[PDB]
């Protein structure tokens, strides 16, 4: 997983937010992108270096009318969690990086996500798509030769417990059941 | 160019919580 597309029609008719991670940095742009139906980043195994390397982008066919650009540090049994909000013009990203010993399900227990970046984007978002790095071998013309979880936020009241170091260590969802209430 | 590639639930438990703001708080229960 390298990034995400956030927008509405996800074509050159409207502005869309493109977030992509790579080896050295994160590039976040807002443009009238003409996105592919199956947008992805190509990756191949370099036979001499014996490692995976970037090839070409197949995310969009064209981009223009760019209004925003931001570049920062990279962040994409290793659980990576993100929260995406779009409030009052700010596209807010929260994140956490936690080591896990699970294969199928998300881990149990509590860990709060911290603010990553507050982006002054100011656009309408109704749909999004995940950008994946696809191995070169999958692009063969034959019929033979990337898991993630998505949830949605709701307007809820939470009781958050801050410990002595100001870390949230537990929380109660006040609408979960009569005891939480 | 573009390539035409197109050819389950889990329990969220108690995860997905984030710091609601940028205010430091300690040893306190905040609603």
């Amino acid at each position, epitope marked *: 997983i390298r990034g995400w597309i956030f927008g509405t029609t996800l074509d050159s008719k409207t502005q869309s937010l493109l977030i992509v991670n790579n080896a050295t940095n994160v590039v976040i742009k807002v443009c009238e992108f003409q996105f592919c139906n199956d947008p992805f980043l190509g990756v*191949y195994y*370099h036979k*001499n270096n014996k490692s995976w390397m970037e090839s070409e982008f197949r995310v969009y066919s064209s981009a223009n009318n760019c209004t925003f650009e931001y570049v920062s540090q990279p962040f994409l049994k290793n659980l990576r969690e993100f929260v995406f909000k779009n409030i009052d013009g700010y596209f807010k990203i929260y994140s956490k990086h936690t080591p896990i010993n699970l294969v199928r399900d998300l881990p149990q227990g509590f860990s709060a996500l911290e603010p990553l970046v507050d982006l002054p984007i100011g656009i309408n978002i109704t749909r999004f798509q995940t950008l994946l790095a696809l191995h070169r071998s999958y692009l*063969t*013309p*034959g*019929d033979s030769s990337a898991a993630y979880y998505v949830g949605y936020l709701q307007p809820r009241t939470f009781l958050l417990k801050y410990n002595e170091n100001g870390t949230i260590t537990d929380a109660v969802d006040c609408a979960l059941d009569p005891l939480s209430e | 160019q573009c390539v*035409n590639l197109t050819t389950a639930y889990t329990n969220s438990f108690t995860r997905g919580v984030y710091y609601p703001d940028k205010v430091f708080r300690s040893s306190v229960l905040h609603s």
Partner: antibody
Amino acid sequence: VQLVESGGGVVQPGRSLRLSCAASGFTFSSYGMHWVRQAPGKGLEWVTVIWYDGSNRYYADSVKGRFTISRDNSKNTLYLQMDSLRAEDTAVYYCARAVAGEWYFDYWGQGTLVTVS
Amino acid sequence: YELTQPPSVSVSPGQTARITCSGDALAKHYAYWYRQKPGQAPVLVIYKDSERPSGIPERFSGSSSGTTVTLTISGVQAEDEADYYCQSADSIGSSWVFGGGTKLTV
């Protein structure tokens, strides 16, 4: 596995010619197909590829916008439609099967000669 | 993604022929070698730089270093007098490339 080309002939520049490659001995619908051409006295030049389900197709720059590749998986037949042919397109056209899971061509047909003059 | 190989190699029968092919792409991806005789379609001899098909004898082998790949043919006979090609593909799988072709004279 057998690949049989047909439809080759002699045409004038600007005219169209359609080639056909009949496939047998394998599950045609599971394999991607290529066309490769070789002008007399010249080496092998890749022309075009079509994916097993026809979802994707790519062309060499030299034929891009002129050639169209298509396939009918119900007839086990590969087609190549060459429009606006030029003298430079004189070559023996081979159909070849893409190897599953790799980037080389394992099975080849016999080839059919197309002359433009 | 161009492939460069010499126009010809001259080898006496019983000797070892070394047909090379070079290009930046060959430091990244695998090379494939074909043997074509007059009047016949190209036949795969080596794949993944060094591996043989079951129809190809042990006299054929391959190796690579940097941007150069080599097809080695030991005990060359009259039957090996053919045009050999190096083949590869780009990083996105949208284009296939052949080298000019090397005529091996026995």
